[PDB]
Ligand binder design. Structure first.
Ligand code: GNP
Ligand code: MG
Length: 166
């Protein structure tokens, strides 16, 4: 079957692992547990296609850029994740996208902007500003919560569908 190599990137503590785990194990992880690198494999049916999701979950920590580059290099799509109550994580998005384009040699790579933690009242980044940024990249913007499961399958399946059209 078709395999889609999906890579999850973004600043530390935005919820990259929580989204992945919610998708793979149907539970919300509430623990403090920084990732170095983890990979997940899951067989799914998306729009009737049987495929395999290889999901690489990456570190948010700066010490790990080298490892992050090696892994970004083999991905066919990227979930660029920020948290809606962390404005610095939103600002850091431009820095992650530029690095993706530099390691992939490409202006236009299959990619989804994910605004996560949308279950929280204390929102510092407005959906408007995120939606604007996503428009200026030419990518979809999806709001998610790993806690409620809102938007989770959407964010992942949308990225698969972007790869299929690339
Ligand atoms: N309320 C809420 N909390 C979340 C959500 N997603 C993640 N978190 C919480 O935020 C913290 C960090 O989440 P985690 O998945 O570890 O983040 P990460 O992006 O993988 N961090 P790292 O870059 O270190 O691997 C955890 O306490 C987790 O439960 C969400 O959608 N809502
Ligand atoms: Mg993590």
């Amino acid at each position: 079957m078709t395999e889609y190599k999906l890579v999850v990137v973004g600043a530390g503590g935005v919820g990259k692992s929580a989204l992945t785990i919610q998708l793979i194990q149907n539970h919300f992880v509430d623990e403090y547990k920084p990732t170095i690198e983890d990979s997940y494999r899951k067989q799914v049916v998306i729009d009737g296609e049987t495929c395999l999701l290889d999901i690489l979950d990456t570190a948010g920590q700066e010490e790990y850029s080298a490892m992050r580059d090696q892994y970004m290099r083999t991905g066919e799509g990227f979930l660029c994740v920020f948290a809606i109550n962390n404005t610095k994580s939103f600002e850091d998005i431009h820095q992650y996208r530029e690095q993706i384009k530099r390691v992939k040699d490409s202006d236009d790579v299959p990619m989804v902007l994910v605004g996560n933690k949308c279950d929280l009242a204390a929102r510092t980044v407005e959906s408007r500003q995120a939606q604007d940024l996503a428009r200026s990249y030419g990518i979809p913007y999806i709001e998610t919560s790993a806690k409620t499961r809102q938007g989770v399958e959407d964010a992942f399946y949308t990225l698969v569908r972007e790869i299929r059209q690339h």
